[PDB]
Design a protein around this ligand. Structure first.
Ligand SMILES: Cc1c(Cl)cccc1Nc1ccccc1C(=O)O
Length: 134
């Protein structure tokens, strides 16, 4: 299919802005915010047929999701929320919506130049996380 070719690979976090405020808006507690905010994760994206896998590896937590676009799944997030997730491709952007406890957050992953830019939005608060090839 080649749907996500330009996302595939191993990516390393190189910059972050407003992530603590995003985590506050999500409801993450103090200690997790502090430890999670230090992490410099590897994001590893691969595709096999229709199944996309995204791994996040860091000193804080190692997470993994596998999914088919448009098909809801269960996710336990790094901060231990139990959420219902749906990921779609919209105009070349991977759009990941998480629902839990009547709340919602959206994580967008986009290729921009040689970077993979991750925008995390909770209500009025956005955090931008910039990844480069590992
Ligand atoms: C670590 C974490 C917590 Cl604790 C809460 C909520 C989000 C994260 N992380 C992330 C989740 C999705 C995409 C990127 C990141 C990132 O760390 O860049």
């Amino acid at each position: 299919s080649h749907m996500c070719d330009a996302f595939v690979g191993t990516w390393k976090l190189v910059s972050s802005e407003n992530f603590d405020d995003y985590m506050k808006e999500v409801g993450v507690g103090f200690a997790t915010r502090k430890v999670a905010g230090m992490a410099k994760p590897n994001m590893i994206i691969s595709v096999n047929g229709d199944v996309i896998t995204i791994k996040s590896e860091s000193t804080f937590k190692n997470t993994e999701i596998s999914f088919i676009l448009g098909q809801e799944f269960d996710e336990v997030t790094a901060d231990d929320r139990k959420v219902k997730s749906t990921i779609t491709l919209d105009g070349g952007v991977l759009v990941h919506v998480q629902k839990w406890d009547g709340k919602s957050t959206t994580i967008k992953r986009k290729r921009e130049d040689d970077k993979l830019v991750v925008e995390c939005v909770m209500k009025g608060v956005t955090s931008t996380r910039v990844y480069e090839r590992a």
